[PDB]
Design a protein around this ligand. Structure first.
Ligand code: NA
Ligand code: NA
Lengths: 183, 183
């Protein structure tokens, strides 16, 4: 596709995301991916661009974190013809799990994954809506690699590179692909 | 499709869901839809059967509740070519919302929806993974109807009719379609 037509599609996706001022607090801008979800053309385009980007990568599994990550991961898995494996806050997955901690602003939290859902060999794509500090993604990577899965790719709708996520993931050997970014 | 072949596909979907004994507590059986998600054939079939069921219904919007509902709702929206509108626990949606309470075992909780995402005219399908007591779905319906959307359909992967969900939704004029059910 011509750079003209690719730019028009990427712009249509970016213009579909709303910017909310002073949310969650004063002096913070919040990029709301829900306006993208309600526009079938923008939502379907975002899934196409993500899935196509990895169509030759030999991905065997897609992992997305709860909750907004499920919105992009699971359609990407469907588009690639591969299973989808959720990573969840603790006590939600019923079968045997492993766990990893991560930092929040005011405390720590954990993510879990089903131990039976990743096995040695698997080539795992991580998908999430937004890359900010990268802490949940760094935890997820650890989870996947502990179960013997290989992960070198993470994909997002939005990157906020100033929050350091992309730079942190790079340190773990993760290449990040984001449809759009903001300052 | 022949009743033979339809039964084989529906069986393949049902056999993909695992039954976990004594979860979340003793003497309760938990039906785990994550084993279905990791099987691309079963996951893709479940989306096809849900989307096809409504292909003539004039649906203009799909609503799913956080979090496992996003797993089925959002691919159904994509398959139908319509927007997806999340219903979330409180303080997660950034734009103007309305709210509805529902009962849990030990307390009350609320769900929210973006007021701008449903407008008069809209014909709304609700999708969720599992129909149990139906309290979250009954709240969601109220939300949609308050914004002027019409909702007469809710779709699920799993129905547990003994917990009363299906019977409660019926009282609100909701027809429920579930791929599988358990006792
Ligand atoms: Na494993
Ligand atoms: Na409205």
């Amino acid at each position: 596709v011509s750079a003209s037509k690719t730019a028009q599609q990427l712009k249509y996706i970016k213009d579909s995301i709303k910017t909310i001022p002073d949310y969650p607090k004063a002096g913070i801008l919040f990029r709301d991916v829900t306006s993208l979800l309600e526009n079938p053309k923008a939502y379907s385009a975002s899934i196409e661009l993500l899935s196509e980007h990895y169509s030759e990568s030999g991905v065997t599994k897609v992992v997305g974190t709860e909750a907004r990550g499920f919105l992009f991961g699971a359609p990407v898995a469907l588009a690639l013809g591969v299973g989808f494996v959720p990573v969840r806050k603790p006590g939600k997955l019923p079968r045997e799990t492993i766990s990893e901690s991560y930092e929040l602003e005011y405390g720590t939290d954990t993510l879990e994954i089903h131990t039976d859902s990743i096995q040695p060999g698997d080539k795992v794509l991580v998908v999430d809506d937004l890359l900010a500090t990268g802490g949940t993604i760094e935890a997820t990577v650890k989870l996947i690699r502990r179960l013997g899965g290989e992960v070198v790719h993470a994909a997002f709708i939005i990157n906020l590179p100033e929050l350091g996520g992309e730079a942190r993931l790079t340190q773990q050997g993760i290449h990040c692909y984001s449809l759009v970014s903001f300052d």
